[PDB]
Amino acid sequence: KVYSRCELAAAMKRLGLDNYRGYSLGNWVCAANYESGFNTQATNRNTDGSTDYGILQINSRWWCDDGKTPRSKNACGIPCSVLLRSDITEAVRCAKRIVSDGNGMNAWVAWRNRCRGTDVSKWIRGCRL
Ligand SMILES: [Cl-]
Ligand SMILES: [Cl-]
Ligand SMILES: [Mg+2]
């Protein structure tokens, strides 16, 4: 599923992402925009044999188990396939776990490079949440 911007913003608000551990909602929408283009089925295979999965491009070394990645920690305690669901609930739970660590949203390269320093509140403008 490719979400629209406001659809995603509403779904993320519903699941408690707005101002979760210091990151306002616009940060989460911005990150999803740049990481995946709002696409729950996005996948990108990395140089290290890990794959990034779903709308927030969550990585299979550290966070989810895909049975294909050396040295995998599976810190979210999930199969990576749950991160390709049209329902974002499992991805949001895992994202909250990720962002709890000292890296914060720097876990998401596209957030670090594309969203950090920008007016992220623009991502929720005009939306009914
Ligand atoms: Cl915001
Ligand atoms: Cl949670
Ligand atoms: Mg990416």
Numbering used by the authors: 1 to 129
What's the paper's own text on this?
Lysozyme purified from duck eggs (DEL) has long been used as a model antigen as a counterpoint to the enzyme purified from hen eggs (HEL). However, unlike the single C-type variant found in hen eggs, duck eggs contain multiple isoforms: I, II and III. Duck lysozyme, often strain and isoform unspecified, has been used to advance our understanding of many immunological phenomena including: antibody-antigen interactions; immune tolerance; complement activation; germinal center B-cell affinity maturation; T-follicular helper cell differentiation; and, most recently, to dissect self/foreign discrimination during emergence from B-cell anergy.
Here we report the high-resolution structure of the remaining isoform, DEL-II. The DEL-II structure comprises two C-type lysozyme molecules in the asymmetric unit (chains -A and -B). Although the overall fold of DEL-II corresponds to a classical C-type lysozyme, as expected, in one of the two molecules of the asymmetric unit a surface loop of the B-chain molecule (residues 67–73) differs significantly from the A-chain molecule and from DEL-I and DEL-III, which are typical of the classic HEL fold. Centrally located within this loop is one of the four residues that together distinguish DELs -I, -II and -III, position 71. Arginine 71 in DEL-II (glycine in DEL-I) mediates interactions between the chain-A and -B molecules: the guanidinium side group of the chain-A molecule stacks against the guanidinium side chain of Arg97 of the chain-B molecule, hydrogen-bonds the side chain of Asp101 of chain-B, and it’s Nε atom coordinates an adjacent Cl− ion (distance ~ 3.17 Å) held at an intermolecular interface. In contrast, the side chain of Arg71 in the B-chain molecule is not observed at all in the electron density, consistent with this residue being part of a loop that packs differently within the crystal lattice compared with the A-chain molecule and with other DEL structures (loop 67–73). The neighboring residue, Thr69, contributes the only direct hydrogen bonds from this loop (B-chain Thr69 O atom) to symmetry-related A-chain Arg14 atoms Nε and NH2. These DEL-II B-chain molecular contacts and mode of crystal packing are not employed in the DEL-I crystal where position 71 is replaced by a glycine residue, which, in the context of the DEL-I crystal, contributes no main-chain hydrogen bonds to crystal packing. Negative peaks in fobs-fcalc difference maps covering the search model (DEL-I) clearly indicated the absence of a substantive side chain at position 37 (in both chains -A and -B), consistent with glycine at this position.
